[PDB]
Design a protein around this ligand. Structure first.
Ligand SMILES: Nc1ncnc2c1ncn2[C@@H]1O[C@H](COP(=O)(O)OP(=O)(O)O)[C@@H](O)[C@H]1O
Ligand SMILES: Nc1ncnc2c1ncn2[C@@H]1O[C@H](COP(=O)(O)OP(=O)(O)O)[C@@H](O)[C@H]1O
Ligand SMILES: Nc1ncnc2c1ncn2[C@@H]1O[C@H](COP(=O)(O)OP(=O)(O)O)[C@@H](O)[C@H]1O
Ligand SMILES: Nc1ncnc2c1ncn2[C@@H]1O[C@H](COP(=O)(O)OP(=O)(O)O)[C@@H](O)[C@H]1O
Ligand SMILES: Nc1ncnc2c1ncn2[C@@H]1O[C@H](COP(=O)(O)OP(=O)(O)O)[C@@H](O)[C@H]1O
Ligand code: ALF
Ligand code: ALF
Ligand code: ALF
Ligand code: ALF
Ligand code: ALF
Ligand SMILES: [Mg+2]
Ligand SMILES: [Mg+2]
Ligand SMILES: [Mg+2]
Ligand SMILES: [Mg+2]
Ligand SMILES: [Mg+2]
Length: 1609
DNA sequence: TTCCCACCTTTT
DNA sequence: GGTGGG
């Protein structure tokens, strides 16, 4: 074995034998620009340095001779071939091997070794295994010839990814398995970092692994530097290796060799070794001796004789210049084209993009990819070059291309059907030699033929990637031989499951990374502003890959809309920077002469003096370019027309043509229904044949706007389709907005795939003009719908959307069909910069959309009292059709639509077309109205005049003006509708007007005034509704009332009590049929929602209510610990639930009500700080949102007998929103319905009110509202009559064998649920025993009375708060004492660290059995609670001071609050199932509050406010505290009762004291002044003595107590 | 023979 | 920050 140096010392060491072995095969593989070629050339250079002959087979067609020379290759003697086929490449190798005249041969990219059959055949031809088999054959033939000639053969390989592998690593190597085996050495090279010069990236930090070794031990590795333009930093290695081996001294920064100092810092030491090559050889020799594991140990004139013989043989076999010396190959010289940006041409090093090469530009949407592309075309055309544009993205605007200076009439342009076609066209143009630059707009849009013919949702694993990989092989060679530049535009996708590096990627696999000679990363970094206006994009381009000059330089410039790249702007900045232009403050001078003030003017001067500009530019280039550069056309046209004819004959009629004459490329628009929007849009409306996205917050106007464009389109005989994936379209409201319902095609699809397949069908039909998809958010993938709630479908919807765009874009353009996508907003999480908002369904749509609209409600349109509309603002966030970032403000008047004529007035007045004299509006002298209201009405009245004013406004304000047959359309329409219905079932698509299941049907809420506020007379069936509000506001109560009303009409209802606080007995009091109310107390939130879905699907339940989304605890959270972080889990779960539920609920006509709690959002000064639990999904999906609030107390002189209540209709999809209802909730009774009826009746003059006397139709019905209400209860027939009339008068939106099948399906679902979620996961409320409320004495009798139910409830959470030393702990201990007295087990969590065991004993606590913990962190405290709760072994737990519950992070902005909120979710369920009472003591921080957030207020079933009100005195001594407890919240009985008692220090609650007072109050004990008597017998004088008597007679005390309880409980 | 792709807040 | 499947 004999070796050759690799050019890297550390590699030669890693290789064991000191280099690569002669007569063997070697493979080097790695990622793009990793250093494969560079390393290769370095070994050649080293070999040539020793008189060896080398050959380079550049199959990759990317070798730069000048750079090879820079790396020290002798160009003039390096044999070099650029073969056509892979077989040719390998046949050349074999010939050179056999000749015995060549010492080292390298083949650059086996990846590029394209089989002959592949090159002859089309791109998209099944050459399965062909290249592998060829490689396998090559090895067999080569191995022997190489050994006998002692010729080293190096193969460079690229990396591909193996797909659907599940072990090791997914990387592979092109060209089969043969090479792995035959290689004696395999090298894995990788770039691991950048070599920096402060600012500059001057090299690549490199690592090579020896992956296979037949020559020495494998798996050693080498790290070194590749310095651009220099090569492997060899002396750098020598320094590091020398220092490591103690041959070179290193004293801090000082490097010494044998006493003599050689340099300071590695940089200088390296330079010294360059300077002393003799000393370098010496150190190197020693390093090798020390570190090489395997020791190495007339003639040449015969070689040349055989060399020339082989070269002659090769050329005679494979044509003219099939092999030659690199230095003399002219066709190898790198020639460049300007990019249109000067600073980019500088960044590129060589002054532009290289001819005959492939280039890729990628970046985010609207970053400038197309614009830049067109600019290079423009520049190329400016120099007589022919260019082609492949618009696969179907979004090129010819008029805009012209504005950028493209010669439209000579720009070849194609809009291909399939990706294969697109690339076959490229290959044809490449081969023709007639086109100079070709650009392909979006590889992302290069849709494989099979994908187009397949359905949406079909899986085509790696197809596009494999197609791209094939294209590169075929193109690379053809492009080089024709000297044709090919630019690929790519989009960015996000890769998922990546924490290191950056998550961005590029469409269409890995092939392009490798084949590209230049890769550009373009990004918009800011706006170019004109005070008000956004007139351009500030732009930055990074040179990410460069084979032509040093990479990683960058260029910043301006893209001025409608103008292009600001070239002269660059020239000014570059000129000033290079001291060619003088800058004295704001004054710019050139050679003494002043040229302008401010960059703006200096730029204008250079436009004016193009001769001077050329001069400055030339000098800037000379100064700053690192790689400077230095009958016929009639043959070209002959070959051009030949290719164009060939293409058209292959791919149909107008598959390729000149842009200027392509009619189907002209942009045509549709009105949006808003005039100011049409102006903002620049071109006067949305573009036909394009994709458009509208996004915004809930109820912002997305659907409304959508419908308005449909209405306008129908007004002009266009056919429209509406895909209501959100399942919330109201046909009657659509009609009100002027939509022709009877002709509006409408679909309510099951899956997202179905929705998009329908779009594609309608697109292809050519019969529909505008399609709108309502909510991509609601486009639920098929796998998700069939899967469970909580199932993970990573990137499924995104990948589905990405597929849809590919398929749709083309079909939409060819049919001239506009497609509008409505999207919702989600919050992205973990983002401090920019804004946290996003859009559902991935990144594809951002790119494909030609227009993106951000719509927002900015205010209310008021009618003094009434909210009659939404003040609206739309921003044009993306625009491919005109300049972006203009905005439109208008009004959406409910039930009417966009106020178009309102806009017309304002725009008319603004443009001085309409006169405004104060309040008087005049048009052409004639007065048209007073106040904007009337002027608007006048324009409605004079539509002819309106058209006239509109036309003028548009002329004045639009930048970008625009302006037998139908029987064929219907033929194709019916064909598509038939096809759709046969594919997706019975009524998958139909005309809106005839869809019955679309009609809105309502249920009474139990409040009349609410039913009125709701507009349509109640909540809508088959829809989702949300009620939110503060604690004890009436959310559950209201909920139960709707159930009660629904049951009253034979409807089946289910209650999901996730909050674990439903009192069956109270539900009965509210009139709920307990025995038939289905009821579940679910463990996890996923379970809760899976139950909903099951009941929805069953079609057997009519109304389902979920009590507290707040309490819907995700499974992972429940199984996790308290303090565990579950970022966005509940939100994401809710978001998933809505997608799955919406559809099932509509098809079953099931109403679903969600109760939500309020949390406070933090860091908010504007608006209001309130929010709702469980993310953003519900806001959007809810058809109605109710804000309920307690506004006062209903009093009975003394007693608080009810809550005065107000409900606001915060969102309404069913009628006008923002109406409100006030009513009374009478405790134990419910909503006072007849009370409302009286007030509404009197208000509507149906009931007479003469002072206090209420009359109905002459007959007096009662005195005072109280009696009138009672009369209506008594006469239900008359009540119905009055109610019916009130509804007729006040509802703005009025309504419209069998049941045995239902029960069959009901029992089926209940069985299914129980088999899925265990024993009693769902049952009838009336028979659920674990639902019964059971109580514990508080130790105070009067408190047990105040509490209504006689004590605190088991399995519930309770809070006691009050000032310091008020008796919180004492009371707590008293309940424990009482509980222990009855054999219950208790735990005390003393987080406050202040419990006195001896005092607890004095209060009668059994100390020895009281479990007690003093926790370190708050999380620990609550985790202990949860453990005890789950154990089912503890009966009462008390936590002393939530205030003292210190978060773990703190004992190292609302951190305790979030922890408490989490605790409640986890505890509530565990406590109920164990029947464990949990008491929280809280401190106080009216201005009073409670520590630890808002969660506890809600979850507590009882809240106690305890206070010391006085001292119990013994003349001198203070022997106790006089105490008062208020019942502030009560879910178990009526609230707001209070208890006063004594806390006697060292004794506890003065129980017998209470007994005296209660006894006297109830006339059981006589009180004659100071004398207390019981049953005639005197028991004491003064309360003090009477108390002592009852202690003495415990038997009598029991008797009195029993009676007091009977009387007062 | 060779990838594709995000989703979501939470709390004074 | 935890979540894979065609
Ligand atoms: N002509 C050139 N001028 C300057 N730098 C170059 C040139 N060609 C390659 N490089 C640099 O060398 C490194 C590896 O290049 P190369 O060996 O061609 O990678 P590979 O062949 O592995 O794709 C890259 O960082 C690249 O920027
Ligand atoms: N027809 C047009 N009129 C005005 N400005 C446009 C037009 N088309 C594109 N632009 C602007 O040029 C910039 C880049 O557009 P484009 O090159 O199409 O981006 P990409 O193709 O990279 O998605 C954007 O700021 C965009 O608003
Ligand atoms: N059927 C209806 N009757 C009256 N007003 C409605 C109706 N539907 C929607 N609105 C009102 O129009 C505005 C926007 O409605 P919509 O277009 O449905 O919002 P989005 O679709 O953006 O969620 C809201 O303020 C809403 O209350
Ligand atoms: N079992 C009950 N007995 C008496 N009053 C009750 C009962 N449950 C609730 N209330 C009262 O009804 C009002 C609303 O209670 P509820 O509907 O539970 O509120 P939330 O909105 O928190 O669910 C409160 O004043 C509450 O005290
Ligand atoms: N160990 C004790 N000995 C005597 N008096 C006590 C003792 N502990 C508490 N008290 C008295 O009882 C009353 C309330 O105490 P406590 O229940 O601990 O208040 P807090 O509401 O702060 O927990 C106070 O007036 C206090 O002085
Ligand atoms: F193999 Al290369 F740039 F030459 F990725
Ligand atoms: F690639 Al684009 F707007 F054309 F993002
Ligand atoms: F998108 Al919506 F109400 F229809 F927020
Ligand atoms: F939601 Al509640 F009391 F039931 F605040
Ligand atoms: F003394 Al305290 F809560 F104020 F125990
Ligand atoms: Mg290479
Ligand atoms: Mg584009
Ligand atoms: Mg909507
Ligand atoms: Mg409740
Ligand atoms: Mg205390």
């Amino acid at each position: 074995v004999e070796t050759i140096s690799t050019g890297s010392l550390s590699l030669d060491i890693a290789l064991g034998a000191g280099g690569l072995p002669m007569g063997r095969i070697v493979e080097i593989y790695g990622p793009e620009s990793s250093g494969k070629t560079t390393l290769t050339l370095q070994v050649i250079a080293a070999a040539q340095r020793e008189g060896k002959t080398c050959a380079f087979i550049d199959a990759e067609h990317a070798l730069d001779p000048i750079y090879a020379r820079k790396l020290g290759v002798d160009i003039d003697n390096l044999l070099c071939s650029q073969p056509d086929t892979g077989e040719q490449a390998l046949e050349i190798c074999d010939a050179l091997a056999r000749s015995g005249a060549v010492d080292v041969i390298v083949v650059d990219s086996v990846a590029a070794l394209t089989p002959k059959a592949e090159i002859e055949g089309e791109i998209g031809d099944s050459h399965m295994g062909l290249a592998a088999r060829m490689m396998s054959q090559a090895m067999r033939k080569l191995a022997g010839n190489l050994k006998q000639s002692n010729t080293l053969l190096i193969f460079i390989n690229q990396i591909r990814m193996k797909i659907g592998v599940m072990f090791g690593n997914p990387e592979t190597t092109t060209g089969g398995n043969a090479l792995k085996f035959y290689a004696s050495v395999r090298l894995d090279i990788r770039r691991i970092g950048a070599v920096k010069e402060g600012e500059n990236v001057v090299g690549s930090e490199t690592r090579v692994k020896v992956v296979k070794n037949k020559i020495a031990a494998p798996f050693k590795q080498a790290e070194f530097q590749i310095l651009y333009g220099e090569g492997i930093n060899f002396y750098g290695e020598l320094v590091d290796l020398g220092v490591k081996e103690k041959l070179i001294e290193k004293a801090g920064a000082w490097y010494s060799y044998k006493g003599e100092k050689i340099g300071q810092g590695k940089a200088n030491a390296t330079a010294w070794l360059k300077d002393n090559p003799e000393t370098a050889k010496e150190i190197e020799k020693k390093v090798r001796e020390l570190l090489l594991s395997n020791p190495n140990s007339a003639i040449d004139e015969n070689k040349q004789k055989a060399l020339a013989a082989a070269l002659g043989q090769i050329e005679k076999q494979f044509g003219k210049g099939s092999i030659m010396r690199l230095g003399e190959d002219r066709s190898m010289d790198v020639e460049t084209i300007s990019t249109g940006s000067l600073s980019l041409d500088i960044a590129l090093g060589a002054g532009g993009l290289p001819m005959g090469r492939i280039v890729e530009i990628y970046g985010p949407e609207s970053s400038g990819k197309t614009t830049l592309t067109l600019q290079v075309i423009a520049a190329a055309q400016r120099e007589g070059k022919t260019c082609a544009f492949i618009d696969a993205e179907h979004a090129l605007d010819p008029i805009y291309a012209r504005k950028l200076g493209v010669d439209i009439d000579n720009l070849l342009c194609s809009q291909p059907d399939t990706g294969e076609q697109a690339l076959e066209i490229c290959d044809a143009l490449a081969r023709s030699g007639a086109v100079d630059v070709i650009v392909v707009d979006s590889v992302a849009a290069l849709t494989p033929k099979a994908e187009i013919e397949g359905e949406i949702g079909d899986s085509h694993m790696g197809l596009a990637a494999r197609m791209m990989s094939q294209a590169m092989r075929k193109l690379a060679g053809n492009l080089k031989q024709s000297n044709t530049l090919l630019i690929f535009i790519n989009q960015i996708r996000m890769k998922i499951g990546v924490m290191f590096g950056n998550p961005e990627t590029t469409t269409g696999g890995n092939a392009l990374k490798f084949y590209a000679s230049v890769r550009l990363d373009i990004r918009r970094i800011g706006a170019v502003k004109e005070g008000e206006n956004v007139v351009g994009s500030e732009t930055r381009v990074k040179v990410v890959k460069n084979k032509i000059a040093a990479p990683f330089k960058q260029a910043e410039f301006q893209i001025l809309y409608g103008e292009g790249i600001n070239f002269y702007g660059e020239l000014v900045d570059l000129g000033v920077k290079e001291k060619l232009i003088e800058k004295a403050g704001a004054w710019y001078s050139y050679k003494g002469e002043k040229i302008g003030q401010g960059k703006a003017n200096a730029t204008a001067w250079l436009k004016d003096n193009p001769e001077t500009a050329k001069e400055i530019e030339k000098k800037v280039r000379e100064l700053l370019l690192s790689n400077p550069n230095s009958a016929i056309d009639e043959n070209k046209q002959k070959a051009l027309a030949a290719a164009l004819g060939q293409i058209e004959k292959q791919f149909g009629k107008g598959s390729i043509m000149r842009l200027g004459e392509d009619r189907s490329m002209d942009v045509e628009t549709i009105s949006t229904g808003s005039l100011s929007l049409d102006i903002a849009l620049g071109a006067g409306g949305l573009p036909m044949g394009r994709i458009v996205e509208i996004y915004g917050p809930e109820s912002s106007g997305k659907t409304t706007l959508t419908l308005q464009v449909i209405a306008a389109a129908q007004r002009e005989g266009k056919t429209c389709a509406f895909i209501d994936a959100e399942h919330a379209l109201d046909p009657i409201y659509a009609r009100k907005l002027g939509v022709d319902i009877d002709n509006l095609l409408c679909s309510q699809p099951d899956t997202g795939e179905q929705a998009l397949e329908i779009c594609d069908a309608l697109a292809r039909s050519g019969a529909v003009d505008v399609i709108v998809v309502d909510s991509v958010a609601a486009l639920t993938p098929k796998a998700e719908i069939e899967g469970e709630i909580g199932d993970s479908h990573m990137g499924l919807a995104a990948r589905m959307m990405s597929q849809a765009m590919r398929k749709l874009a083309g079909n939409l353009k060819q049919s001239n069909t506009l497609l509008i996508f409505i999207n919702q907003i989600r919050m992205k999480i973990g983002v401090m910069f920019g804004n946290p908002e996003t859009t559902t369904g991935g990144n594809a749509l951002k790119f494909y959309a030609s227009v993106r609209l951000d719509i927002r409600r900015i205010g209310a349109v008021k009618e003094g009292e009434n909210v009659v509309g939404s003040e609206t603002r739309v921003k044009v966030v993306k625009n491919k059709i005109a300049a972006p970032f203009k905005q439109a403000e208008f009004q959406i008047l409910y039930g009417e639509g966009i106020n178009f004529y309102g806009e017309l007035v304002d725009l008319g007045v603004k443009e001085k077309l309409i006169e405004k004299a104060g309040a008087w509006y005049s048009y052409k002298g004639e007065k048209i109205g007073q106040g904007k209201a009337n002027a608007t009405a006048w324009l409605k009245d004079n539509p002819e005049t309106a058209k006239e004013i509109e036309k003028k406004v548009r002329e004045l304000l639009l930048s970008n003006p625009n302006s037998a047959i139908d029987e064929n359309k219907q033929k194709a329409l019916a064909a598509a509708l038939g096809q759709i219905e046969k594919q997706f079932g019975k009524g998958s698509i139909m005309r809106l007007g005839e869809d019955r299941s679309m009609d809105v049907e309502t249920i009474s809420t139990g409040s009349l005034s609410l039913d009125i506020a709701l507009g349509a007379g109640g909540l809508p069936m088959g829809r989702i509704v949300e009620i939110y509000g503060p604690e004890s506001s009436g959310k559950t109560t209201l909920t139960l009332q709707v159930i009660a009303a629904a049951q009253r009409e034979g409807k089946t209802c289910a209650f999901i009590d996730a909050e674990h606080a439903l009192d069956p007995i109270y539900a009965r009091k509210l009139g709920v049929d307990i025995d038939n109310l289905l009821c579940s107390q679910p463990d996890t939130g996923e379970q809760a929602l899976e139950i909903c879905d099951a009941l929805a699907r069953s079609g057997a339940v009519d109304v389902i209510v979920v009590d507290s989304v707040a309490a819907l605890t995700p499974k992972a959270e429940i199984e996790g610990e308290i303090g565990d972080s579950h970022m966005g889990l509940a939100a994401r779960m809710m978001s998933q639930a809505m997608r799955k539920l919406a559809g099932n609920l509509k098809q079953s006509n099931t109403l679903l009500i969600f109760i939500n709690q309020i949390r406070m959002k933090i860091g908010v000064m504007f608006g209001n700080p309130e929010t709702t639990t469980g993310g953003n999904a519900l806001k959007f999906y809810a058809s109605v949102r109710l804000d309920i609030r307690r506004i006062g107390a209903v009093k009975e002189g003394e007693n608080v007998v009810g809550s005065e209540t107000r409900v606001k209709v915060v969102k309404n999809k069913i009628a006008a929103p923002f109406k409100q209802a006030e009513f009374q909730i009478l405790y134990g009774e419910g909503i006072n319905f007849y009370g409302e009826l009286v007030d509404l009746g009197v208000k509507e003059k149906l009931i007479e009110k003469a002072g206090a006397w209420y009359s109905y139709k002459g007959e007096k019905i009662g005195q005072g509202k109280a009696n009138a209400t009672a009369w209506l209860k008594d006469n239900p027939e008359t009540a119905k009559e009055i109610e019916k009339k009130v509804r007729e008068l006040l509802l703005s939106n009025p309504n419209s064998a069998i049941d045995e099948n239902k029960q069959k399906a009901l029992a089926a679902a209940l069985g299914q649920i129980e088999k899925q979620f265990g024993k009693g996961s769902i049952m009838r409320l009336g028979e659920d025993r674990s639902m019964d409320v059971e109580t514990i004495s508080t130790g105070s009798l009067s408190l047990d009375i105040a509490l209504g139910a006689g004590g605190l409830p088991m399995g519930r959470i309770v809070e006691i708060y009050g000032p310091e030393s008020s008796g919180k702990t004492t009371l707590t201990l008293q309940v424990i004492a009482a509980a222990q007295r009855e054999g219950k087990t208790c735990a005390f969590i003393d987080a406050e660290h202040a419990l006195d065991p001896i005092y607890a004993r004095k209060l009668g606590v059994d100390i020895d059995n009281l479990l007690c913990s003093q926790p370190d962190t708050g999380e620990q405290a609550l985790e202990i609670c949860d453990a005890l709760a789950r154990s089912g072994a503890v009966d009462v737990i008390v936590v002393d001071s939530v205030a003292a519950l210190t978060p773990k992070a703190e004992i190292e902005m609302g951190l305790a609050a979030r922890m408490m909120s989490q605790a409640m979710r986890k505890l509530a369920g565990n406590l109920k199932q164990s029947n464990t009472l949990l008491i929280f003591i809280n401190q106080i921080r009216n201005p009073e509050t409670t520590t630890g957030g808002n969660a506890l207020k809600f979850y507590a079933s009882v809240r106690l406010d305890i206070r010391r009100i006085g001292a119990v005195k013994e003349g001198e001594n203070v022997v106790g505290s006089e105490t008062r407890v208020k019942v502030v919240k009560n879910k178990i009985a009526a609230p707001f009762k209070q208890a006063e008692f004594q806390i006697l220090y060292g004794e506890g609650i003065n129980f017998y004291g209470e007994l005296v007072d209660l006894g006297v109050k109830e006339k059981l004990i006589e009180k004659a002044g100071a004398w207390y008597s019981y049953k005639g017998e005197k028991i004491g004088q003064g309360k003090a003595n009477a108390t002592a008597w009852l202690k003495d007679n415990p038997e009598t005390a029991k008797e009195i107590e029993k009676k007091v309880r009977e009387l007062l409980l």
